[PDB]
Structure formats: C-alpha cells, structure tokens
Design a protein around this ligand. Structure first.
Ligand SMILES: Nc1nc2c(ncn2[C@H]2CC[C@@H](COP(=O)(O)OP(=O)(O)OP(=O)(O)O)O2)c(=O)[nH]1
Ligand SMILES: Nc1nc2c(ncn2[C@H]2CC[C@@H](COP(=O)(O)OP(=O)(O)OP(=O)(O)O)O2)c(=O)[nH]1
Ligand SMILES: Nc1nc2c(ncn2[C@H]2CC[C@@H](COP(=O)(O)OP(=O)(O)OP(=O)(O)O)O2)c(=O)[nH]1
Ligand SMILES: Nc1nc2c(ncn2[C@H]2CC[C@@H](COP(=O)(O)OP(=O)(O)OP(=O)(O)O)O2)c(=O)[nH]1
Ligand SMILES: Nc1nc2c(ncn2[C@H]2CC[C@@H](COP(=O)(O)OP(=O)(O)OP(=O)(O)O)O2)c(=O)[nH]1
Ligand SMILES: Nc1nc2c(ncn2[C@H]2CC[C@@H](COP(=O)(O)OP(=O)(O)OP(=O)(O)O)O2)c(=O)[nH]1
Ligand SMILES: Nc1nc2c(ncn2[C@H]2CC[C@@H](COP(=O)(O)OP(=O)(O)OP(=O)(O)O)O2)c(=O)[nH]1
Ligand SMILES: Nc1nc2c(ncn2[C@H]2CC[C@@H](COP(=O)(O)OP(=O)(O)OP(=O)(O)O)O2)c(=O)[nH]1
Ligand SMILES: [Fe+3]
Ligand SMILES: [Fe+3]
Ligand SMILES: [Fe+3]
Ligand SMILES: [Fe+3]
Ligand SMILES: [Mg+2]
Ligand SMILES: [Mg+2]
Ligand SMILES: [Mg+2]
Ligand SMILES: [Mg+2]
Lengths: 442, 457, 457, 443
C-alpha cells in the first residue's frame, strides 16, 4: 500500500493512506491553503502565517494516532481498519467549512450580513465534504478500501457536526468512544485542539508544555456511567494541567488580542461594504455574493482570503468604500478602542442581535450634555466568546485496575479617531453598559 | 517604539522611522508573497511570507551593528548608521515578485529573455517608490538622517555599488556593507534569518546559533580593509552554519516536486501573461512580465495572481487555469532526469527559453513510437547562487584571538563541497507510459551533444 | 523498571538490575560527595554530587550502545553487553573520595607518597565490595549476565586493561569499540565527559555548545587501521570543536579557579592535621584512618564529605588544629596566593614528590636576604594537572570521521592549544604584608632553581 | 565588592557589608541544608542548598529596591534602605533546620508539640546571633547603617511585625511601607523569595519556568492603594503573573507534594525522633542540646545541619540502632507504604500541636468488619500537607496614569510492608476519616 509522507514542523513525518491523498487533492480541500488559521491575528503576529490546510493534515494525523493506539491496546473494542480511516477522514475534513479568515467569517461577518441565517463552519464542513466526495468521485475509492459509503460518510459528518436514546446513526452505541476523538465538547479535549494548540504556539512563539504523544500512548477506553469514553492515565494529570494552561495562554495572549480583534472587525466592515458588488460564480453559473456563497458549495469553493486582495486591488469605484477601509489597515489607521464590558450573569448576547448593537450604543444618552453626536456606523461592537476546574470533567483510570474509571466579553471600537469624538464614544459606551446592565467599564 | 513578537527572534523593537516605513502599501505587499514559492505545495509548514522574513533581517541587522558599536566605540558607528543598516535589512527583499525566486529566476527569463532583472534591483526601485509615495524623507530628516546620503547607503547595502566604489559611506565604515548582504563569504544577517526561519517552518534542525556569533563578532583590519571577524572559538558554529545551508539547499530549495510545481506555476503565468491587466501609474496597463517596469503596478503583483487565474471564468485564461487546476488535482509534470554542465560553461538566463526546443530537436538513434514537440518539454535550471563561481567561504572568513584582538589570525575536507551549483532537470508534460519513454531518450541524446553529464539511471 | 527525572537528560529509564545496584549503601554514598569538591565554595550553584553524575553516565552509556547496536546489527551487540556498559557507566565513579579529585589528586599523595592510588582503582574495589555485600551476582545471572566474565568486562571498562596483543580479558577484539564508551583515553570522547561537561555547565552557569544527542545520532563503528572504533559523521566536526572548547572553558574557568584550588588545599591541610585523630571502622572491626580508609572498602563506604563537618563540629581538643583551618574557610581567611609557574620544557612534577615541594620552596635562597624568613610549614605548593601523567596531544588527531557515501571507511589553532598542562601554584599560610613579600621571593628563586617559567607580576 | 557567578541570576555583586555577613559560621551553615529536603531522594537534580537560594534572594531584593528608588526618587529610598532590604533578603532563611521544611513542618511539632517554632523565628534569632558573634554592628555603621533602627527593620522584613489598625512596624515609618513587600509578602504571596526558588527549583528539577522576574522588576512601581503605599505591576504584565502562578502550581503538584518525596521526609523525621534522646550538640557554655532542643540556643543550632543524617547513619552506637535502621531502609529503598489520602472537611485546619495525636487516633479507630491484623500507633505515619484567581489580590497601575492603582492534605503511610498489614491499615484509615468526618478516601 503506497503512502505519501509529508514533513510537518509540528508532528514530523505524517504518513497518508492513498484514500486520504485522493480526498486531499481536490479543489475543495486545497482551498484551505488560502484561509489563515488565526485570520486578523497575522497582522499582529508576523509568525501566524499558517493556514487551515496544514492544521487539517495535523488533525487527520493525530486522529489516526489515537484510534490506532486504542485499537492496538484494547482489541476487544473491535476497532476496524475501516474505523481508523473514517476517523482520519473526519480529522482531515473537520475544517472544510471555514471561510475567509476563519472565525471572523462565521463568527462576525455572516451574523452581520445575514442576521436571520444560522451558519457555523461545522455545518459548512459537512456540506463542503458532501460536495467534495460527489465532485471528485470519492465513493468508489472508499469502497475499494472497504468503506461502505452511505454508512461511513454519515459517521464522518457526525464526527464533525454532531448527531444529524442513542442519537448517532453512523456507528452503534458500543463504539461511542470514537466520537470523542475529533470533536469532544463534554470535556473540550480532542485531537483538533491538540493540533492547533501546538501549531499556534509554534507560530506565535508561545510556550507549550503539553505533550500530546504521551497522552495518546496512555489513552484508554473505560466504562463510565454505562458509557464507553476515552480516559487518561491518572499520572498524566500534570500533563493535562499543562494543556489547560497552554489553552488559557493562547486565548488571553492571542485569540482575544485587542488589536487582533480590532483588525478583524475592520476586514469584516470592508466585506460588508463590498458585499453588494462582489460576484462569485457558483454552480449552474449563478452568481452569489460573499454572504450568499455559503448557500452553494461550488461558489463557496472559490471563497477564501483572496477576497481581501480582490477588494484591495480593485479599480471599481463601487468598491471604493470597501477598499479604503482595507487601505486603513495597510497604513495602520485602525479603529480606536473605546472599552470593554461583560454581561452580568444573565443570558448571552446572540449573533442575530449583533447588527442591532451599534445602534443601541449610539442611541444611549450619557448624562452630561455632549456636543458631539455619533451615528451608529461610527461604532463597532465586538462580541468575544469563551469557554471551572477542568480536570474534574476528565475521566481517569488506574493502572492496576483499567476498564475502571476513578464567558462573553464585549468590546466597542470607534471609527472616529479625533479626541472628542473618542471622548463622546466613551460616554455613549459607559451609558449603554449602564442601561443594558453590563459590568461598569474600567 | 513598537514591539513585535516573533517566533524566531522573540521581541523585535521598532524605531518610529522603521514603523513609518513598514506601514506602507509597498512594504505590506510582502505579506502576500510566500518565502519558498512552490515549496509550500510540498512542505505544508512553509506558509511563511517575505514580510516576516524582512522584519527579521532588519532586526538582525540592528543587533549586529549595535553589538559592534558597544564593543568598539572607535568604529564611530552613529545612531544614524544603525537606523540605516536596519532599514536596509528591512527593505532588502522589497523587490521580490510572486512566489519569490520563481519570479526572477525563471518566469522573467522565459517571458523577456532580453531583459536583465533581479529582485534586488526591484528592491532598490521599490524602496524609492515607497519613500516618494509616502513622504518618508521629511520623516528621515526628523530623526537625524540625511536623505540623499543615507538613501544611497541603504540602496548600496542591497544591490551593491551603483578606487573605493561606494558613494554612500567612506571606506572606514566599509564593514557596514558586510551586514545585510555579504557576497564574499556569504555570512550576513539575511541568511541567518532565513536559515533559522526556513528551518523553523520546514522542521529541519538549524544548528547555527546567530546569537553566539553576534556576541563574539569584531571589526578587524584584514588586507588594509575593515572586516567583520569571528572569534576563533566560533569555528564550530560557522561549520554548523555551512551545513545548515546545505541541508536547506538539498532538502528544500532543490526538492524535485517543489521545482516541478514552480515550473507549472510559471507555465501558467506565461499562458496568462497576455490577457492579465495590472493597473500601474497614469492608469496605464501592465502585464505580469511587464509589471516590473512600473512600481505602482508591481505593488499590486503578488501571489494573488495565482488565485486570480485559478478562480477566473474568462475563457481566454482557460489554458493558464488548466495548468493550475492540474496542480490542485496533483497531476504534475513528470520528471525525466537530471544533468550538470561539468567543465563546460553554465547555462545563462537569456538562453532558458531556447532549451526546450533543443530537447525536442535532439534526434535519438532509435525510432520513437511517440513524437514530442518542445510544447511538451520543461527544462529547469537550478542554481545555488546564479553567476557566482565556486568558492570556499571558510577561506574568506577572518578570525581573531582572545590575546590579540584587532588583528586577524593568520591563515576543510569536512565542509560542504558545492556552494554554487548548476543542475539542469527536464520534465515532460505528457504523462502516458510511451510519451515519457520518448522524453527520456530525447533528453539523454540532448545531454550528449551539449556534452553534459550522462544522466544516472 | 524505574524512571528517574533528571534536569540535564530528562527521563532516565533504569533496568531493574541497575536499580538493584543503585539502591545500596556503596552507591548511595555518592550522594555525599561534591562533584567539584571545593569548587562549591566559589560557585554557589555547584552543589551537585557524584550520584547524579553517575546516573547520567549510566544513562548516556546505554544510549550510545543501543544507538550503535540498532543501526549496525552486524556488530552483534547483545542485551548482556548493553547492561554491562550501563553498569560500567553507573559505577565508574564509585571510587571517588571526600571532595572528589582533591582526595586522590592531592590528599592521598601528601598523606602516603609511597602509595599509588587512583579513584578509578577505588571504583573497581568499591564495585567489587558492592556486588559482594549486596548479593548482586545472582541478580546478574537472573538477567542473563555471566558474572566472572562480565564483572571483568565492567571493571576493565573503568580502570583499563588489568605489547599490541589484545589486553582485555572481558570482551574479544571484535567488540573492542565497547571499551571506547565509558572511558576513552585515546581521544577523550566518552559519555563520562559528556555528562559532566553538560552537568558542570548547568550548575556553573557556563554555556555548553556540545550537543551529545546529535553526536550519538550520527555515531558509527568503522574500520580504522585494523581497528574497530567509534567514528563521527563529517557534518559533526563543528559539534566536536565545540566539545573541545567547552572542555577548555571548564578547565580554565572552574577546575583551575584560583580560590577554588586554594580552598581545596586548605581542606587537604585540615585532613592531614586530622588524619592521626579520626577512626573509621572498617571490615573485621579493624580501625582505619582517613588516609588508610582506601585500604578497606567497608571503612571507605562511610568516608564522604561528612568528614568535613565532623572535623568542623568536633569538640575533641586533639582536632583543634584541623578545626581551626576549616573555621578559617568559613570566615574566608584563606591561604594567600603567591604565584603561578609551569614546568615548560622540563620534566613534570610527579605525585610522589608533592610532599617534598614546600621544603624546596622554603630552602631556596631568595636573596637579597629579607628580615622575614619562612619554614616549609608556611608554604603550600599546589600542583594542578589537566590530565595527570599524560603527554601533550592534540585530540582531533585520533578522532576518525566517516562519509555518508562511504558509510564504512574512516577519512587547528582555531582549537584549544592546551590539553595536558601542569600548573604549579604557591600559597603562603601567613597573611602579613612582609611574610607575604618574603614568600614571593622564596618562590621566585625556587622557580629559577628548578628552571620553571618566571612568575608574572 | 565581590562578584558571584550564579546559574540562575548570572553575575551577582555583593557589597562589602553583605560579604562580611556571608562569611560567618552562621550563614555558611546554609551550605549544609538541602533546599527541598527529602526531595533529593526522588529528584537527583535537587542537590541545591539554602545557601545559594539565600544569595539569590539577597540579590533579587536589592534589584527591586534599587529599581524602585531610581524610577521613583520621590519615594525616599536611601542606600541605607537598599542595604537593609538586601540583608533581609540574604538572611531570611538563616533559621531553616535539617532538610528545611521537614524540620519546622513535621519534626519539631512531633518532638515538642507544646513549642511554637517557625524557621522565620529562627532566622531572626540566628541573625541576632550572627551580628553579635561577628561584630557586624561597627561595619554597618561604616556604610551608614544605624544598628538598632536597622536591625529591627531587617528582622521585621523576615518574621513580620514583632509585637491594632495602627501601623505595627517600628523599623520604618509608614511612608516606607512598600519596603516590607519585597522580601516577604503574605498579602498576595508575591516576593523576591518565591521568584528565586521558583526559578531555582525549576532549574534543578528540570521543570519549565515561563515567569520572567526581570521584566516584572523593570515595570514595578509604588502606588497609593487605600491609604497605603504598595508595589504594583503594570497592567498588561498580567500575562507574566499568570505564568508565575502556573509555575507555582506545578512545583507544588510535581515536587513539594510528591508522594515518595514526602514519605522519605517522614522517614528522616522518624529516624530523628528515635535518635533525638541520644544525640548531643554543644551549644553555648558547653551545654549539651538535643536535636529538638537545639532551636533554644543558636550556638548549638549553628552546628545543626543535614550532617546529622550522616552522623546517625555512620554511628556505631547501639542506642542509635533504631534511628540507623530507618535511614538504612531509605538507602536500601525499602520505604513506608502509601495507605491513602483525605482532606479535612470545610473550615478546619489540623494544627501542628496535634500531629502527634494523629497516629494514635488512627490506630484507635474501630474498623468495623474485624481484621486479622492489629496495628499500633507506631505502625502509622500521618502526614499533613498544607497549601501555601490570585490576580485579584495583585494591584496594577496604568502606563498613562501610574501613581494610582487599577487547603490541607492528609496522607497516611504504614511502616509494615507485608500485604495484609496494608489491608488492615487501609481499614483503620478509612474508618478514622469517617468518624472525624473527613472526605471519603478514593478507592
Ligand atoms: N505598525 C505595525 N505593527 C505591527 C505589524 N505587525 C505586527 N505588529 C505588532 C506591533 C504592535 C501590535 C499592534 O500595534 P498597533 O500598530 O496596532 O498599535 P495600536 O495599539 O493600534 O496603537 P497604539 O500603540 O498607539 O495604542 O502588533 C505591522 O505590520 N505594523
Ligand atoms: N475571534 C474569534 N475567535 C474565535 C471564534 N470562535 C472561536 N474562536 C477562537 C476560540 C478557539 C479558537 C479555535 O476555535 P475552535 O476551538 O473551534 O478550533 P478550530 O479548529 O479553529 O475550529 P473547528 O475545528 O471547529 O473549525 O478560535 C469567533 O467567532 N471569533
Ligand atoms: N499529493 C500531495 N502531496 C503533498 C501535498 N502537500 C505536500 N505533499 C508532499 C507529499 C509528497 C510530496 C509531493 O509528491 P507527489 O504526491 O506530487 O508525488 P510525485 O512523486 O510527484 O508523483 P507519484 O508519487 O504519484 O509518482 O509532497 C499535497 O497537497 N498533495
Ligand atoms: N527556486 C529557486 N530558488 C532559488 C533561486 N535562487 C536562489 N534560490 C534559493 C537558494 C537560496 C534561497 C534564496 O537565497 P537569497 O540569498 O537570494 O535570499 P532571499 O532572502 O530569498 O533573497 P534576497 O537575496 O533578496 O534576500 O533560495 C532561483 O532562481 N529559483
Ligand atoms: N567571600 C565569599 N566569596 C564567595 C563565596 N561563595 C562564592 N564566592 C565567590 C566570590 C569571590 C570568589 C572567592 O573570592 P574570595 O573573596 O574568597 O577571594 P578574593 O577575590 O581574593 O577576595 P579578597 O580580595 O577580598 O580576599 O568566590 C562565599 O561564601 N564567600
Ligand atoms: N583539582 C583537581 N582537579 C582535577 C584532578 N584531576 C582532574 N581534574 C579535573 C579535570 C577534569 C575534571 C574531571 O576529571 P575526570 O575526567 O577524572 O572525570 P571525573 O568524572 O571527575 O572522574 P572519573 O575519571 O573517575 O570519571 O576534574 C585533580 O587531581 N585535582
Ligand atoms: N530506587 C530509587 N529511585 C529513585 C532514586 N532517586 C530517584 N528515584 C526515583 C525513581 C522512582 C521514584 C519513586 O521512588 P520508588 O520507585 O523507590 O518508590 P515507589 O515508586 O513508591 O515504590 P514502588 O512503586 O516500588 O511501590 O524515585 C534512587 O536513588 N533509588
Ligand atoms: N514538606 C513541607 N513543605 C512545605 C512546608 N511549608 C511549605 N512547604 C513547601 C511549599 C513552598 C516551599 C517553600 O515555601 P516557603 O515560601 O516557606 O519558601 P522557603 O524559602 O522554603 O522558606 P521561607 O518562607 O523562610 O523563605 O516549601 C512544610 O511545612 N512542609
Ligand atoms: Fe480545527
Ligand atoms: Fe532575504
Ligand atoms: Fe565521571
Ligand atoms: Fe526562601
Ligand atoms: Mg511523490
Ligand atoms: Mg501598540
Ligand atoms: Mg513507582
Ligand atoms: Mg581569596
């Protein structure tokens, strides 16, 4: 069986089964070369040039390592070569659905452009994966290696987006542990996070003391509360604490960076101003816009970070408004940071209300008379989401007896950089916080 | 003063003047040009761009001058000098085009053989455009720079002298010209960065330590010229440098599939060249091969042109697109063989275009079952350093003693052999079993009458 | 199967047999002896003991055989061999005494000039004492070792052969490369040095540019003049140059430290003054003294750095003279430094003459005669050897390299000059301005009369 | 001025006054006491001693005062202050006994339950003894120190206020309050002492340390917080502090709280107790003290170091046979076996005075199904491990507007290693937990 070997800066040599190679070499997979992992992060962190493509190879690699390690150590689990491939394909394809600049796309842009629509890149990954297998005739290739397509493709989608009393149609309840590999949000520990923790740390120059190889050699499937779940050896606990500290550090230092997130709302603002005028040719030659390409995977296949440059380089005076914001990024005249607040206890601010937020802020009236008035378009309101002692939700096992177990941050920016426009914005913002019952700004 | 965190160097502090230069459309362009060109399509970690490389070299440039200045106040290194050395480091790669070395090393030679073009020339041109467009000269004067001398100094550090040849600095500061680009012994801050950075991204170990070497550098008189010298105990570090360089050339820059892919991208650019319009100065329209003539058009020419071609519906570009679609589907030119010009004169850029027809015209002894025209051949010339003959860089490094600084130590089989090479590879665009068989002996016969080495089996 | 975490080597996995040997009074004894002896009284970070160094050498020893055995199966390296190399690594320093090299390099020579003793000899004796006392031989057999072949192999790996006939009884000549692992006296490259270079550096805060992991990765056993020997890959030459400079740095900065050595002679002076009065109970209940404790391993087992505090804390008025010298160390009233000389182009001083030396200094005739004169008891003469009883050799000569394309066959004033020196220093026990002036003149005359080099100012 | 090369801090410069203080039997003593005590028997890199740690803290304390005095000359920081903070840094651990925290944390409570003893108290006593014994007061005066003003300040920095809501410190006025936050800060637990041993313990244990103290010192400022002058961090140095706290948590989890490490420290303690009666240390006036009584006289205590371990191990004396055999069990690596772990239930802390009673409570527990072995109190070891988010108790300041701010673990070991003794000890232990209402031991 002919394997491709890929040298990876994080995992070293990655061997790829011919089936994975066929899936990798499609316009739909190669597309991920053109989407930055951290999006606007790159404009803060010069080392963060990495793309979704290499990350996905990693997740596919690690996904395989874990199933195979489990299968070798516990043959009773009945893990087939068919299972290993399906877990690897899920690992490979879990991010197919991301759009330009990754989380900026499904996390801010689509909510702003089309508030009524519900879209996640996970939903995209399932759609794009379906599009991928159909477009490139993957089903025969699967059958050749013993995969049964209607049976397994379902499994794969479920590993990505979740169940489409045992909710899963792709595998029976006795293999339930397989669903904990690629995406696990019970305890938020999975091969996806293992790759991007190590890979972001590598490109951001942040210290990562978590050893994922250790964790995989010692992973075991044990019965917990009637349920088969992946468990860690008890003395790997110190390792787990290192993982959680690495994750916290990536969030405070990188994902939540004040300038990083500012720049991402600027790229978003430019997309919104370009949305009317940009045409992406989809299936049947129909034309979609940036916000609608998610509706058709053929158009969406051509929607990547390139759209940034398409806007930047364009001559069309209709795109002038979009273009000048991107030029603002280039010249580094950025939105200025007004303040930060949290919603107290309560309910989370929701994506469908994102569009409404700047108008709420501008409609606040601070109690001292202010001689500057600011429109709602003068404001940017940025909703940043986060996800306890995390070690309690991890299940462990003892060596001597295995098979036995033992959040919203809200920032506001102003497009006006002169002092008393900025002074005004501050007053709007503190007042808005007061009457929406948010925490009082520093 | 801005601080930028970098995975190779850690914290890079930037003087306000540098920040002014960096925050321009001409510098930010380098975010959109991959360092290793087609390398990325082989090494998934090699997503890095010219931008971060440039910040790095500007930073290393600064570290080295500053280190010398503190250890040797007699050198009379001014703060004016250090900023100039930093800007040169920062701007040395400004002239790179889409996919870096693919552009000036193959594409331009194929498109416009008559023209002589290096990205270094581009960097000097682009640096001028950056300064004029963004009014940097007043900002230079503000910080104590004299624009007409210092701008010359900076350009000279990049492309060399435009009987002491340099107009930008006198002969007593000559050692400053050894920092950004050193052509004698190839030891400079530019290589230190991309050695460290490429290794970081390729997952190849770099055993050269630049911090050690910078700590111990001195300027000493050697053959009545001021030169940067290494202390004697650094000999081991320099050998590691020369070996890291070899690994990078052999494992990465010369990678067979990587270079095939660079010829596919180039083949795509050529087939797209007539029909693509880039808007330059005075609203004039330029092509990919022509964008080098105007810095305003060239500012808009980056790797993006690959995707512009790939996503395009225009049927005039269908041919360019079909090659780029081939790369995505991973049906690539197939590799015929490799040969070297031993004892003969190495192939020159102006002759690259002619090479495929020589191959198609070879006429092998046996009758062929399939005939191949030159459309079908790709001939790739791979140079370590183009237009440089072979030198042992260890010779041109001067060392100094603990007990006798300020004077060099007076001056093997374990070093890398080859420091400037020419490799000639041939690929065939037809992938069927008997077309390829044809291509091989066309190639073997082609080698024979140019008296190149007989391809190994 | 125990794993022990180490700050230099990370995780060290220990075969049960090694653990069994380690968990004995004779091995745990090494916890109580400082690696650098008096170095600690100058380098506060140098708290490390023989114990952790020995685990390291055991670890590195195992790493190298395994790397050789796995890459070159033709060498037929057995599990029996790997264990024996590990035991040798672990036990090579068993024989060190209180404050390490102070003990066999100075104290014993001064106490018993007649005796020829090395700590390596000690290691052989202590290893024998260890295996007998703790019933290791059955445990050896249990794991596939043949005790009187292997114990012999292990001892020979430590102390050497017990003309040009093959001297080793423990292993045949086709495995000869095994004897190059723990102790290599031809080129001074072995796992012992690797560990303490890295370990001493770590505690002294000195940078270690030698990477042993790399060297082990690339090591091969090849043909050299009839002879099977461990060889380095050609690209590792830079790493070996770094090893030699680190060694030179450690020797110059730490082992030859002025105060460090003054303090070790003070401790020795204390031991001598205490030697008559301290009984250590050995085998058969017989009583041994500090200097005779080397005669019986049961007594020697209880002889560690502890003897320093025993003397210091003692009430016995017999011990007051010894005690007072150790107390002067605490108060930092030390022997004062007179000067340094070398026996260049002369015959080097031998251990059996050490005691005679102060008498020679005190008997020199300095004159112009001075109003102060000194007895021999007022002088301390310190002989500092890089390698004792070893001729000056350049070690890169005697290292063989190999080429990739010829996997098996073997193929410098940028290097340290210095590989075997004798340094002779003189201290004076009297601290007044005029005695000190007198002692200098005695010393300068003594140098002249032995035709050693003239003391500097 | 002497320079000392140190593997953690690089070159450390020592003022002549400090050198005078260092070169005494009372300070040099710390060369003979392991930082991590029994830790060395688990972690071979942990050979470091109190001596080098104290130089470090003396060095860092100085770096911080000097950085403050220079960036804020309005703050009144004199050279007299800088020297006094350095001495406090230098001498803060003078009071540690054999194997450090084993001595004051377990041994002394077991030997003399009635006595209240901390090594910080020792440090103050030993420091007084150091200055008197060696004639340090004149030397202080040469360099501008006033001995009974300053000695008081130095002691206060170490043991805290000696003798409510008034300003408790006599050694410095309240406008110097920030000085008392440098060497020892109980309030928020961030000081030069921890910085040193976090970095030093990590270096010797091979644990990665991401906290950079040098940056933190560069950005430190004194600001007004609630009536009070206090040391503050620049606001986005918050990230550095999180790394410090992660290092602290890791060191407690991987090292200080290590199972075998602590077990061996109870074995050393058990040997000391059985040796206590018979060992004589000569104190002042030729008076003889015991291991446990040496804390009562600093001249005796001066000669009490890790050496006492070997004195026992090497002794021929048959009264010491019991002590010697325990230490021999350590050497042969036959160790007390781990029975279980529990935590006391809400609020209540087991107190040092009651430690002795704990093995007898356990042994007197009535496990309810009856078992074939009975165990004495001497068969049990009860080990109480005390813990020394945190960002809320740190005060920060803004760059643009500085001046203004923005449990217990209980383990049980059994000394008899035969299998069914262990089954028994387990049942004694689970039951003891039950009727003292501690958390139920995991299975
Ligand atoms: N100016 C600039 N900074 C960069 C770039 N890439 C990374 N950085 C680093 C430097 C600081 C950080 C962002 O700095 P900004 O220029 O956004 O500074 P700011 O915080 O918006 O403005 P200010 O510093 O005035 O508050 O990211 C770049 O291309 N230009
Ligand atoms: N700025 C921003 N960051 C986000 C958003 N959602 C998540 N992040 C941060 C938190 C984690 C990090 C990566 O997200 P995931 O944990 O989903 O990892 P991923 O591999 O990128 O996502 P997935 O595999 O689900 O596509 O990015 C968002 O909407 N906006
Ligand atoms: N197939 C493939 N390989 C990749 C990719 N990215 C990196 N690589 C690595 C693995 C193999 C190497 C390129 O080799 P190819 O797969 O093109 O193989 P080839 O030698 O050209 O043809 P073949 O092996 O089919 O005979 O680079 C990718 O997207 N697809
Ligand atoms: N594919 C390809 N690679 C090249 C060519 N010329 C050089 N290379 C390889 C060998 C070294 C590396 C570039 O080294 P340079 O010293 O030119 O460094 P650079 O930073 O890329 O360019 P600059 O000289 O402008 O700094 O890329 C070429 O024409 N084509
Ligand atoms: N004084 C002293 N120095 C130490 C100690 N530990 C390490 N050192 C370093 C500092 C200097 C070196 C020993 O130098 P000494 O002060 O003993 O000798 P010196 O340098 O000639 O000092 P001086 O000229 O004052 O006598 O070792 C210590 O405990 N006391
Ligand atoms: N002070 C002193 N230093 C010595 C003497 N002999 C050697 N040294 C220095 C030079 C090297 C360093 C260690 O020497 P070794 O190579 O013997 O190494 P070791 O590991 O200490 O002992 P062994 O050879 O038994 O392993 O100590 C001596 O007699 N006195
Ligand atoms: N045996 C032994 N282990 C050591 C030494 N130094 C460090 N270690 C490490 C290796 C294992 C770790 C724990 O010690 P042990 O394994 O002896 O104790 P344990 O693990 O509780 O005993 P066990 O697992 O055999 O019941 O300590 C040493 O000198 N001897
Ligand atoms: N075994 C044991 N460890 C302890 C005890 N108290 C604290 N520890 C651990 C946790 C932190 C580490 C050092 O604590 P300290 O903050 O006291 O630091 P120190 O330098 O050792 O002592 P000091 O407070 O006098 O400076 O030792 C104890 O009572 N027993
Ligand atoms: Fe992902
Ligand atoms: Fe460059
Ligand atoms: Fe050794
Ligand atoms: Fe302390
Ligand atoms: Mg291939
Ligand atoms: Mg900024
Ligand atoms: Mg164990
Ligand atoms: Mg001295």
């Amino acid at each position: 069986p002919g394997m491709k070997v890929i040298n990876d800066p994080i995992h070293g040599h990655i061997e790829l089964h011919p089936l994975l190679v066929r899936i990798i070499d499609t316009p739909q997979f190669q597309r991920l070369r053109y989407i930055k992992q951290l999006g606007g992060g790159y404009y803060v962190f010069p080392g963060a040039s990495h793309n979704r493509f290499e990350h996905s190879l990693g997740v596919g690699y690690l996904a395989g390592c874990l199933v195979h390690a489990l299968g070798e150590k516990q043959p009773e689990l009945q893990i087939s070569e068919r299972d290993v491939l399906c877990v690897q394909i899920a690992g490979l394809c879990h991010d197919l659905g991301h759009g330009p600049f990754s989380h900026m796309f499904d996390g801010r842009f689509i909510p702003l452009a089309r508030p009524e629509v519900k879209w996640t890149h996970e939903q995209g990954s399932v759609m794009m994966f379906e599009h991928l297998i159909n477009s490139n005739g993957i089903k025969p290739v699967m059958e050749q290696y013993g995969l049964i397509p209607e049976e397994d493709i379902c499994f794969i989608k479920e590993q990505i987006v979740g169940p489409l009393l045992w909710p899963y149609k792709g595998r029976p309840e006795n293999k339930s542990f397989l669903y904990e590999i690629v995406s696990n949000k019970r305890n938020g520990i999975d091969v996806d996070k293992w790759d991007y923790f190590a890979r972001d740390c590598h490109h951001l120059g942040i210290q990562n003391n978590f050893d994922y190889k250790r964790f995989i050699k010692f992973a075991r499937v044990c019965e917990v509360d009637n349920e088969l779940r992946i468990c860690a050896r008890d003395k790997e606990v110190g390792n787990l604490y290192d993982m959680f500290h690495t994750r916290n550090s990536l969030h405070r230092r990188a994902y939540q960076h004040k300038v990083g997130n500012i720049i991402d709302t600027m790229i978003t603002d430019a997309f919104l101003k370009a949305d009317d005028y940009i045409e992406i040719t989809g299936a049947g030659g129909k034309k979609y816009r940036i916000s609608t390409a998610i509706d058709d995977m053929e158009a969406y296949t051509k929607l990547t970070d390139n759209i940034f440059l398409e806007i930047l380089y364009s001559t069309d005076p209709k795109l002038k408004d979009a273009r000048e914001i991107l030029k603002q990024i280039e010249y580094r005249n950025l939105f200025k940071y007004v303040g930060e607040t949290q919603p107290t206890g309560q309910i989370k601010i929701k994506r469908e209300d994102y569009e409404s937020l700047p108008k709420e802020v501008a409609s606040a009236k601070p109690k001292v008379l202010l001689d500057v008035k600011l429109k709602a378009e003068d404001f940017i309101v940025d909703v940043i989401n986060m996800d306890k002692n995390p070690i309690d939700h991890v299940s462990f096992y003892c060596k001597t007896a295995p098979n036995r177990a033992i959040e919203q941050l809200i920032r506001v920016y102003c497009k006006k950089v002169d002092r008393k426009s900025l002074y005004a914005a501050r007053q709007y913002f503190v007042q808005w916080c007061a009457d929406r019952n948010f925490t009082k700004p520093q």
